[model samples]
Target chain A: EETLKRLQSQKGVQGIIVVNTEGIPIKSTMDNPTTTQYASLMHSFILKARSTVRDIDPQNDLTFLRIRSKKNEIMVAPYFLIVIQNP
Target chain B: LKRLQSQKGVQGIIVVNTEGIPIKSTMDNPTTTQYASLMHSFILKARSTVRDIDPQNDLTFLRIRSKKNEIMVAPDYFLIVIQNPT
Candidate 1:
């Protein structure tokens, strides 16, 4: 909760969410949180992508990813992901 | 290094990052690698001193002279040229 709260309060942090080993959203700061399975979709992709990255370059590890569009942006990592809607 | 090696007055070239881990180098011999490591250390020391003059200062290029060798340091890489003194 503390970790979630602090990260949620950061300047560009619109929302922060974390997933469990079973791919369930255990913590989130979004007002209208969705089901764990749906909220954990980004976590699933990042987990698989991280493995794919290591296979290509054994010396490098994927620690972060950011996808940006005109309307919204999302950043993902191993366990948690952030959605900075407009900002 | 194909072009640089082909150029005149070029003997050898060594390229390394701040951590002294070689990124790419034309060096093949063990002695050349050792020489490059020492050159990297010298550049780091010089960089610190230059920054003391101004916080925004950076080590863009450097030249070194010895009895028989001359070295040039650039971003993330260094070059060594060996020519007998006239």
Candidate 2:
């Protein structure tokens, strides 16, 4: 809840979804229909991110990831992912 | 310059303080300086754009594309790294 709350505090931040270690969403602060979708995508995204990290530095642990585009920015962590949409 | 250049993919890096003054940088040659100066304005515009969207938002990481290199920004710091297409 704290993570979700802080994310929502950002101006453009639209929503936050928390995924468990098992790749299941445990909580979210957005609409119901999109929560599962976001969680699944984020889960797979993290897998790729982790793989990339291991490919570079096997000793390093995943901390955070951010992806930006023309419209929005998405930040993902191990426990949660936050989406910030341009307003 | 040595440490940044040491990185496998990093070509250059520049550090700008809150006042937009160039503190230290890997490449200080006129060419890179010009690019850094332009990045200063670029970052300012990006900050303005984000603020325009929501006044409370502050600029974070930014990536500006170019033909030869890419300009990366994080608040005050401006970094230009070279990458060759794979």
Candidate 3:
């Protein structure tokens, strides 16, 4: 919990939340009520794809994925909520 | 934000509300997850560093380390990433 406080002070970071592989709300810092399963879905695909890509190529595996779209706010640690910006 | 958050050392992330409240977090396991008071925790961490240093000094960035925890503060918000650099 103390570590969580220190890192939450960074400038660019906006918000943080913990989601299960299913995107279920395991833990959150936000006040508003919300839930989604996209975190799990996102992790499932990106982690596999990234590993596959690494196996085929000569580079390190893609450890994480970040999608930038008007309606997208997801991060992945492959079946792990890890962390993410607020929704 | 996406590109940066995807970094290797980033164990977790927090996004603050407009009023400087940490309303969201992406921490691992998060056995110790709480938001209602995280914002205040961050503020105290920041002020601790500045407490001993001269305000006019050019110490705009810092990372205070304790035995099992760390803090990273920025101008707008904070990022409480977990680190086990040992």
Candidate 4:
């Protein structure tokens, strides 16, 4: 909770959602609806992205992912720390 | 294309359409098809995720950093670059 609080306080940060590999929300700084959507979609996206990396090179593995959009930047990691921010 | 592949760490480059079909690639057929298909799916979901958060927002770029490689993608017609991180 404290970690979540600190991250949320950062400039440009919109929210933080921590999720399991199963796409279940474990901890979040955002509301239920928003958290659920982010967890589910991001979970699936990470899995696919990870597989893509591995398929290209058998020894390669995903470390991080960044999605740059017109209004927000989303950062994702394994065990799934999703940080949505405006920049 | 030649210039990009000539760079020290770059492994390959691929260009795919919105449908995820490879229009051009520096890799073999099997590898090219696999990457195109998976990345296409990923890009679709990522774009939706952005729009879901802000209806007016849209995805512009995506980067996946891996232990041995780094994958960078640009959304317009989907330009993909696979490179060695080290």
Candidate 5:
């Protein structure tokens, strides 16, 4: 989609991957191997993240997740929009 | 443990092993297990994500900011803390 392109064009943007609630990759701006790896790992991570939020407070929900590592910053938005960027 | 709980904004704390099993917790049984299981999986996945990207690199610390709380996870026998930043 054009949205993916727009995001991929942004400064420091590395990749964009979109996955379903089931964690299946629906769209990606990266290659097969890289996309597959990110899709799978990020899907599970988002699920667990959401569960953690709700567990603490049943009314609470996870809107977004930002992971800062030594190399990159990974962001997960609602409906599993994963954006990997340089920090 | 008591020292941490007495600190500002700390809601609860749970310590878990590599297997994600709770070693100690300041919360009740259900709450402890829920946090341990979910956070353990997150910690594992986050670590793998870091390593897979660059084999030479690693995940030293993880912090998740949500609307209602901030969850902090430190590895090598994970120590997870839930705090209200508001």
Candidate 6:
């Protein structure tokens, strides 16, 4: 995942990895992959978002979702998802 | 930055050739499954669905579900669904 390299270039960032909502890691370029846990969280976050989306239209795909945490807030958009945690 | 290029969205996908390698993995691995293989599977099934429907400008993409995950496929890529509760 080229994006992982780019994200790692960020000044404050420690590591980056990619995983699916099922808590499965696809690419683990991170020196330390925190993907399993993140994926689990992502699963819950998407479900919560989708629950809200169903009220509008069940068929429509959920385009964006986000979770506000005390230290970091996970931000997800249409085709890309990432969680930015506080250092 | 990566986020900017990846766009600001929730469910993102990347195109892969027939080889099942991810051309781009813009988002988190929602299914943590391989992209190319998944995309391949979705395409095969979708083509059959299209055959049943009118083959015009592409009407509706089919949604597939398994006990573990849900798959939403488009022309080039498949979006992995993670509606499962953790």
Q: Mind sharing the TM-score for model 4?
A: 0.83
Point out where model 6 deviates above 4 Å: A11-15, A29-33, A78-80, B1-86
Ranking by lDDT: 4, 5, 2, 1, 6, 3
For this target, which candidate reaches the highest lDDT against the unseen true structure?
Answer: 4
Tens digit per residue, CA lDDT, model 5, B14-77: 9999999999999899878768887877788888877766688667667777777788887769
**Model 2 over residues A1-87: C-alpha lDDT tens digits?**
676687688787788777788678777788877675456655665665555444333564545556554456666655555464562
Per-candidate local distance difference test: 0.53, 0.58, 0.42, 0.84, 0.82, 0.44
Model 1, residue A54: distance off in Å is 42
Per-prediction TM-score: 0.43, 0.49, 0.33, 0.83, 0.68, 0.38
Clash totals for all models, in order? 0, 0, 28, 0, 0, 17
Identify the candidate with maximal DockQ.
4
Task: Tell me the deviation in Å of residue A14 in model 6.
Answer: 4.9
- Between which residue pairs do clashes occur in model 1? none
Query: Alpha-carbon error at B65 in model 2, in Å?
Result: 20
Clashing pairs in 4: none
| Cα lDDT tens digits for candidate 1, B14-83 | 6676676666667676746655555555555545533543356454544433334344556635444332
Instruction: Rank by TM-score, highest first.
Output: 4, 5, 2, 1, 6, 3
TM-score of 3: 0.33
DockQ of each: 0.02, 0.04, 0.02, 0.65, 0.39, 0.02
Model 1, position B72, has a per-residue lDDT of 51
Q: Which stretches of candidate 3 lie over 4 Å from their true place?
A: A1-87, B17-20, B28-32, B35-39, B48-59, B66-69
Among incorrect, acceptable, medium and high, the docking class of model 2 is incorrect
